[PDB]
Design a protein. Structure first.
Lengths: 331, 218
C-alpha cells in the first residue's frame, strides 16, 4: 500500500458524503431514521471509547471512496461502508460491540429520544438487515447493516484482522476520516483556502496505479490466489458498466480461474439461483435495463471461459441465466 | 480448550446420510459438509431454530438463525451468519459439536476404506483412523471384528462373544488362533497400503485414492 493526500476537490466531495442525510427504513412500525454519517461515526466512536475499547482508525470504504476520488463515475452511489479498526479478543467484546451499536441507534429519533428503553432486540429486528460475526484464524471482524432500499444501505464493519480485502483496483480504496472528524474543533465551516490533510489508501499496491485505473475505467486485480466465488459476478458488473481489462491477454486466464473457482464454491444449482437472484436484487434493484445486459454478459463469460470438462454443469447454469432473463424480460 | 476434549471431525470420503433423532437432525451432505439442525416442536409442526454447518475438515463452523419447517434437507442460509474457527468456538456450542463429532466418528467406523479379498476371507479396514475398525468376514460364516479395545468373534453356529485384552488371547482353541493370525497379516498389509497410498496422494494432488477394493471372490 501507499499513502495519498486528498486534494481540495476530493475533501469537499467527502464532506458532502459525510453530511448527506441518509434515510434508514424501519422494519415494522418503527419510524424512518434521518441519520448522517458524521453523527453515527461520532456517537459510535465516543461510546466505544466510553466502554473501554480503543478505536485506532475510522475509514470509509465501498463505492463511496471511489465516488469521492472521481466525481460521478460509473460505479453507483448505493454503497456506504464504514470500517472501525478495533481489537476483538473475547466474545465479550463482540457482544459489547453489538450493544454499543444498538444503543447508538436509539440516539436518533424525533421525540423517541426520551423513549430510551426500546430494547436491543426490537432494534435489531427493526433496523438491522444483515449481521455477520467472523472470528477465525486470519479473519476477525463484525458487520452490522442498515436498511437497503430507495436510498442507500449503510454498513458498519469493525475489523480486528482481515484477510486483505483485495478486489478490483477500482474498489480497493479507503479514506482515513479521523482528520475530518477532528476538523469539526473549528468554529467556522470548511472553505477552499482552509482544509484538513486527508489520507487515502489502496489495500494492495501503488495507490496512483489504482487511481489511474479508476480515472481510465480499467479492470484490474493483483492476487488471484485469494479470489473466491463471487469474483465472477463482480467482474460482470464491471463489464455491464463499460470497464475493460488492462490487457486482453491475461484476462482469458483470470476468467477461467473465476469460472472454475465459482463452480468450486457453488456446485448445487439451487444455491446458484439464490446467489444470483439476490445479487440481481442487490445491485439492480431498480435498474431495469441494466439487469438484462448484465445477465447476457454473464452468459457470454460463462460460455467462453468454462472449461470443456464441466460442460454439463455449464449448460445448467447457462440455462439458469437464460430463465432469469425471460423474467427480467417481462417485468 | 476445546481441542483438549475431542479432535476436529473429518468428513472426507464419507457417503451422504440424513440421520433423524428425537432432539437433533445431523446430515452428511453431498458436498461432504456436516450439518446439525436443532429441532423444536410447536403443536401441529416441528421447526428448526438454529443450523450448525461444519466444514469438511470441520475447521470452520458457520452457525445461523434464519427466522423454518422441517424438510428433506437443511434450510438455506440467509444473511445473519456467524463463522467461528474450531479454537474460538464458545462452550455454548461444544455439546452440539461433540454430537456431530460422535456421529461422523461412528459413520467412519462403518464406511469401508480398503477392502481386501484373500483366499479365505473378506477383510474390511474402516475409515475411523487411526486404529480403524477391522472386520474379517470368513467365507464359511465366521465373523471377526477388531476395535482399539474389544475384539468380537462370531461362529457359524451364531455363538456370539467378545474379548478384552491379552489375558484371554493366547489361551484359545488353536482353530480360532489361525483366524486372528491371518487377520493381523491383513491388518498390517492394509495399514502399509494406507500409508504408502496417502504419501503418493500427497505428491499427486488429484481424485481420491480411497475407497479401494483389492482382489475378488473365487
Amino acid at each position: 500500500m501507499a499513502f495519498s493526500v486528498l486534494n481540495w476537490d476530493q475533501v469537499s466531495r467527502l464532506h458532502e458524503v459525510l453530511t448527506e442525510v441518509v434515510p434508514i427504513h424501519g422494519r415494522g412500525n418503527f419510524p424512518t431514521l434521518e441519520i448522517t454519517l458524521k453523527d453515527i461515526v461520532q456517537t459510535v466512536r465516543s461510546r466505544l471509547e466510553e466502554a473501554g475499547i480503543k478505536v485506532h482508525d475510522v475509514r470509509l470504504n465501498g463505492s463511496a471512496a471511489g465516488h469521492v476520488l472521481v466525481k460521478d463515475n460509473g460505479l453507483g452511489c448505493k454503497d456506504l461502508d464504514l470500517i472501525f479498526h478495533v481489537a476483538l479478543p473475547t466474545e465479550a467484546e463482540f457482544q459489547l460491540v453489538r450493544d454499543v451499536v444498538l444503543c447508538s441507534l436509539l440516539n436518533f429519533l424525533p421525540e423517541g429520544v426520551n423513549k430510551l428503553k426500546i430494547s436491543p432486540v426490537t432494534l435489531k429486528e427493526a433496523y438491522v438487515q444483515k449481521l455477520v460475526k467472523v472470528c477465525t484464524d486470519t479473519d476477525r471482524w463484525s458487520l452490522i447493516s442498515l436498511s437497503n432500499k430507495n436510498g442507500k444501505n449503510v454498513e458498519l464493519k469493525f475489523v480486528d484482522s482481515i484477510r486483505r480485502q483485495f478486489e478490483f483496483s477500482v474498489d480497493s480504496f479507503q479514506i482515513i476520516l479521523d482528520s475530518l472528524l477532528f476538523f469539526y474543533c473549528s468554529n467556522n465551516p470548511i472553505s477552499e483556502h482552509f482544509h484538513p490533510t486527508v489520507i487515502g489508501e489502496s489495500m494492495y499496491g501503488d495507490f496512483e496505479e489504482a487511481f489511474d485505473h479508476l480515472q481510465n475505467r480499467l479492470i484490474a486485480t493483483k492476487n488471484p490466489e485469494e479470489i473466491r466465488g463471487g469474483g465472477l459476478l463482480k467482474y460482470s458488473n464491471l463489464l455491464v458498466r463499460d470497464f475493460r481489462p488492462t490487457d486482453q491477454e491475461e484476462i482469458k486466464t483470470l476468467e477461467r480461474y473465476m469460472c472454475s473457482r465459482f463452480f468450486i464454491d457453488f456446485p448445487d444449482i439451487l444455491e446458484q439461483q439464490r446467489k444470483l437472484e439476490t445479487y440481481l436484487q442487490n445491485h439492480f434493484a431498480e435498474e431495469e435495463r441494466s439487469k438484462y445486459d448484465y445477465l447476457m454478459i454473464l452468459r457470454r463469460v460463462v460460455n467462453e471461459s468454462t472449461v470443456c470438462l464441466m460442460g454439463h454443469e455449464r449448460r445448467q447454469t447457462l440455462n439458469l441465466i437464460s430463465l432469469l432473463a425471460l423474467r427480467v424480460l417481462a417485468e | 480448550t476445546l481441542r483438549s476434549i475431542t479432535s476436529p471431525l473429518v468428513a472426507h470420503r464419507l457417503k451422504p446420510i440424513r440421520q433423524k433423532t428425537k432432539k437433533a437432525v445431523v446430515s452428511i451432505l453431498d458436498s461432504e459438509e456436516v450439518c446439525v439442525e436443532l429441532v423444536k416442536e410447536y403443536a401441529s409442526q416441528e421447526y428448526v431454530k438454529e443450523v450448525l454447518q461444519i466444514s469438511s475438515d470441520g475447521n470452520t463452523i458457520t452457525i445461523y438463525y434464519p427466522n423454518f419447517p422441517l424438510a428433506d434437507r437443511p434450510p438455506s442460509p440467509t444473511d445473519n451468519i456467524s463463522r467461528y474457527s474450531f479454537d474460538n468456538l464458545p462452550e455454548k456450542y461444544w455439546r452440539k459439536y461433540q454430537y456431530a463429532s460422535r456421529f461422523v466418528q461412528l459413520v467412519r467406523s462403518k464406511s469401508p476404506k480398503i477392502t481386501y479379498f484373500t483366499r479365505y476371507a473378506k477383510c474390511i479396514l474402516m475409515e475411523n483412523s487411526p486404529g480403524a475398525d477391522f472386520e474379517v468376514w470368513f467365507y464359511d460364516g465366521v465373523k471377526i471384528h477388531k476395535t482399539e479395545d474389544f475384539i468380537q468373534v462370531i461362529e457359524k453356529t451364531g455363538k456370539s462373544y467378545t474379548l478384552k485384552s491379552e489375558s484371554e488371547v493366547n489361551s484359545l482353541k488353536e482353530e480360532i488362533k489361525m483366524y486372528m493370525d491371518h487377520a493381523n497379516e491383513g491388518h498390517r498389509i492394509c495399514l502399509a497400503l494406507e500409508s504408502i497410498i496417502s504419501e503418493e496422494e500427497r505428491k499427486t494432488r488429484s481424485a481420491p485414492f480411497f475407497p479401494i477394493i483389492i482382489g475378488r471372490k473365487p
